[PDB]
Amino acid sequence: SHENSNSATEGSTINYTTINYYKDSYAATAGKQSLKQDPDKFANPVKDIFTEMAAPLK
């Protein structure tokens, strides 16, 4: 469709597949999100990454 781009997610690293009938995108459904993940951002935010095999304190 040729609608406005007022969705709160317009321009997200994860694309959505939604349904809409009005001219404003934020009225659309929630749809399906893309299944990407980045655990390391929170679980391993270390500068100099350390291997599993090796001892963490070299």
Binding site: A30, Q37, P39, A43
Partner: protein, 242 residues
Amino acid sequence: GFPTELKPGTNQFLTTDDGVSAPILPNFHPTPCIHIPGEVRNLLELCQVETILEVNNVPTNATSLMERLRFPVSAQAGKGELCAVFRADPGRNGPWQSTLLGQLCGYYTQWSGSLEVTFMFTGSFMATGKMLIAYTPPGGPLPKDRATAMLGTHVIWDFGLQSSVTLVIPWISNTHYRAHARDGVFDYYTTGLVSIWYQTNYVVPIGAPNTAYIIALAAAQKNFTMKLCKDASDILQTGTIQ
């Protein structure tokens, strides 16, 4: 007009229905989204972050609450004595309720995956010791002694420069998913037990404390997933919030 015919469901309001609704502000464009650090895309990302497991969940008076965050070890009598025990059930009342994993878990009816608990020794540098940490799969009663515990999945931890050791609680279930286990027929989904024993002994020289503590940090492995979204068991409100 075009021939239509209403079916059951007409007029109902389903809270989880994902439909379209009329926009109140036509041609309205939201404030652009700048870059903000720490965006999270999936709750599973949070489940892989270790949080403190209150293995020592006995003190209750306000002034001693911080003591739940750590349990002790100390010089023994070399009889492979028991140090501590707790159920591995992540979505069950107990030690796991202090972890973010345990809380997020409460928003899902079923879970599946291996868990991991990392123990960090905070004693003095001169303190040494070896511990036997075991995981007893379902059906195995609380090991009466170290010899019995040793028959299941376990790790023998040696104190040294590396302050921590990781016990993996591998996914060993009959069903692909487990629902939150609790006393009763639902104990069918119990994960098992974790017991900690003295393999050798907490040895220390003259001049160093005879008692040190261990901090447990738990989280989930990368094969962990949850399903069947549900409301948490707790509702943090008594009367109306004003």
